[PDB]
Write a protein that binds this ligand. Sequence first.
Ligand SMILES: Cc1ncc(C[n+]2csc(CCOP(=O)(O)OP(=O)(O)O)c2C)c(N)n1
Ligand SMILES: Cc1ncc(C[n+]2csc(CCOP(=O)(O)OP(=O)(O)O)c2C)c(N)n1
Ligand SMILES: [Mg+2]
Ligand SMILES: [Mg+2]
Lengths: 537, 537
Amino acid sequence: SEITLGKYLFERLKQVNVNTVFGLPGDFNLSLLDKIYEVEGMRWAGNANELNAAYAADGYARIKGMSCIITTFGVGELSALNGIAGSYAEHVGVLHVVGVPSISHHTLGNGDFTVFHRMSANISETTAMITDIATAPAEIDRCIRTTYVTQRPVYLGLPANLVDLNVPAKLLQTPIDMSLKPNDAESEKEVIDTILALVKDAKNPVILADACCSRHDVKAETKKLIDLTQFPAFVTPMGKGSISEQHPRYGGVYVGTLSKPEVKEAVESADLILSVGALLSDKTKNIVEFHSDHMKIRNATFPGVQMKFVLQKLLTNIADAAKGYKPVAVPARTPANAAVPASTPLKQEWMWNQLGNFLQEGDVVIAETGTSAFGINQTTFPNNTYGISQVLWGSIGFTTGATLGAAFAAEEIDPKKRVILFIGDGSLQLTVQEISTMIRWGLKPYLFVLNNDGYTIEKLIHGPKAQYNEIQGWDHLSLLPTFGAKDYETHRVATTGEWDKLTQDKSFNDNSKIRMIEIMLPVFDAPQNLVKQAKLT
Amino acid sequence: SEITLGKYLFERLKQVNVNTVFGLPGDFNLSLLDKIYEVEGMRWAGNANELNAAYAADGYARIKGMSCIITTFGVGELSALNGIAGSYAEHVGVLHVVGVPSISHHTLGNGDFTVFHRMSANISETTAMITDIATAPAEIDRCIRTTYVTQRPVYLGLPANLVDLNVPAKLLQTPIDMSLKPNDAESEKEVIDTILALVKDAKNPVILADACCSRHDVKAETKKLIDLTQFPAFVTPMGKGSISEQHPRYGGVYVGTLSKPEVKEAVESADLILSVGALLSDKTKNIVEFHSDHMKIRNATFPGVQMKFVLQKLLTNIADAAKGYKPVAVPARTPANAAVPASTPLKQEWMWNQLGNFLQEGDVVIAETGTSAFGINQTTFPNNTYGISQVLWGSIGFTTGATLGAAFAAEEIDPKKRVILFIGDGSLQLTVQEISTMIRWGLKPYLFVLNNDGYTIEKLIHGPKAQYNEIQGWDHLSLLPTFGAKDYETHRVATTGEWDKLTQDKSFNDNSKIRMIEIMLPVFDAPQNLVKQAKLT
Ligand SMILES: Cc1ncc(C[n+]2csc(CCOP(=O)(O)OP(=O)(O)O)c2C)c(N)n1
Ligand SMILES: Cc1ncc(C[n+]2csc(CCOP(=O)(O)OP(=O)(O)O)c2C)c(N)n1
Ligand SMILES: [Mg+2]
Ligand SMILES: [Mg+2]
């Protein structure tokens, strides 16, 4: 019994729970594409562009675990590189499948069929050009396993002839191994023992969860490590959402010198740091760095000890190792907004603080690079909030495509999960078309547009009234109907009373339809942290 | 007097007549952008996105001769690559300046600042990463020179700390030399002698003007060749616009089996083909191919013989060598559309035939990849008409970007000149935001959108009713008002009498404002030949 290699692929993605496929049709992938519709439960999004399709595959991967985008040779694959590069930089598992010319137009005119391939290799964890149907199955399995486990994009070139070539159906009965290989027994024990020893003598331990605590599936574990030790817990901007914020031991968002003094104080105060961190983007010497494929304890490095299994194993013992810890007070949460007359103009500072009152458990919150990304660090999330902020890549326009991906993924996990976006008016312009795809599928994201007339974050760094920091003023509330939305809602908010009246409304709170909210704000208005950050940069 | 390095760039650009710069602001280019406003005659377009800006730079360059696009490290340069690759593939001189960090966010997280430079090197004629002020001026010059002479994209990396360093203003007093190196004397002598020999014995010789007849300077040399020999002249789809279609010796568009039969026969029966600037496609014996960097006679190649020198010397003796020529009749041009009831539904075979009545000398006509680019080949142009058809690279949203760039370039040449776009409903989606930039500058193109509901060129070849060939339906006429347009016109056309009524109107024929014309066509409708090819496939 046999199946086409083109259907093998889609069957493998169904087994890994990639049910939606991103990308655009083109000359070299039509026969692949046809196979999606033969796989019950699969769907082709129909993106408005390849860049947008990649931003989307990122959004989807962030939520569901992995994603797949399919493009066509030359023209499709090159348009998507900015998305791909960003998933590499932030450790998002995206499988980029490119439909290429059959073994032997949309070329550079020099007979070089490997150039686009070479370009991609610089931003892929691994790459594969399928040449033989004999190894082909094993190559797809490999690419899929690797995208999953390293959480990095992988490139797979598939010649048009092969797609319709047959393979043994039987191969689908054995699942792809999607799990981490166990740790070296001995090094793993030494790490565990050393950490336990350190916890025993620390008087003021602190936990700090960054990017990779989320990106590398360790949130249930970090979460329980806090309950078992009662140590103060801080998150960085990229890790925001990694830790439940209504946890009585959550201390806030640590952003170094830019940290609200007590946070700065409580963190720099520690005699022990358990960093379920990330990069060396930049107290004591007593730091434990937890990393996806290695540990570091003070100056000691332990290559290939995976944090997943050390964390799991520490949970069985840590409590008795910390039986002796006297709980230090955690910095108080920022107080609620003092009541004001309904006619008070909306200001960012008041907004970000007030937003914690509309959010709910299970929401997915996306903030674009600009004032939005700075502001969101000032909002307190209900527990179980998934935040998306591209702090490291910082490619504006990313959130519209990502919102599409997260809504698709969220629709699949639970139809009640709300997807909320905060996007600058300047950023929207780069990827606005993707809204069209939201409409087509009946997804219902909350799209909040920050109308402040131009590039505020840029104006705050350089050239406040410079022509290049200014944009063409669009009629945003007409966007929905222009893209053929039938059932949607549009709102404009400019004061605190409009903010409250709208966000406390019962009906508004249910994701029953797609909605756009235009936020009227002053030009030089920004959250305290951007006011204080960028000022210096 | 001494000036900034950043200002020096823009004064050189203006010396080679680039008055509009494309791109988007970012973290590493703000200080360079400041320099554009210190230079009289220069303008920052303010693009809605980087891919769209690359496409515009391409269209600007096609018109003016060269262009410049400025982006920012990582996020910005990566987004433009599909545009840059197209300019490389089709020989369009685009200079891509990228603002880079300071020689000390938006990286892959690995400390490697060269990865992006390296990626672009594969789609660039040459590349430079400036690092020394003492050498900078010469490097800027070299890159400008190379872009202009090779008619291929160049990558120029400019650290933000250098653009503010001073250089002697006296440098701009000695212009960049665009002179070409002479050819190997014996190879060139050999080519010239052989071509004149072939011409002498030819009974039915024809001229073929292809793609790089225009971007490569030879349009003048080519016309003199026609006048001097009286040989019938044909263009290929990529060279349309290169020969004036009202010339008595012009015989048509040579497509393959797709050409008009009278045209297919006329070209195919020639005993000598003089092919100028071929990137090509294509009984046909004696084929002389003129290329910018090489000649080809029959099967023999002469690497290094530049067509430029060969054409100029041939124009001195060609009339002698062809003096025995007895003028063959050129194929007769397509007869006017027969009269039909005003009620008749719009069909493409009819429309492309009818469009020639609307065009005027000096027009700029752009056609997107899809049915429009197949159809345009059936249109008869008045003299001095520029055609833009991205035949080889074939990147579907290219034309909305191209249009903005040809509109700015035309404006600088002569504001009375019209820019006319033919785009499918499906391609507009990938690049629709760039209509916004056209509005901001008060540019006034004719934007004709072919609404045939989805991807008909692909439906004609594979999956006539495959979901991946359909698209979300948009309210096309609401795009202008959604983007803040103030002075504009919108129009819908569905029948023959509607076409005529609009296009014969005198106010309509005047480019007093931006216009959008939506054309309703049947889903499987296309140029006939295209439809017939289609079924035997
Ligand atoms: C693709 C890309 N191009 C350019 C930039 C540079 N950039 C960073 S912030 C910004 C302006 C964003 O404006 P807006 O979305 O209006 O946010 P605001 O600060 O006004 O809320 C720009 C152009 C980038 N990060 N990525
Ligand atoms: C950037 C890119 N992505 C995908 C394609 C594949 N492609 C070629 S034509 C086409 C559809 C063209 O649609 P439309 O513009 O509506 O044309 P028409 O209906 O007149 O054929 C697509 C998706 C491409 N050429 N370039
Ligand atoms: Mg803004
Ligand atoms: Mg169409």
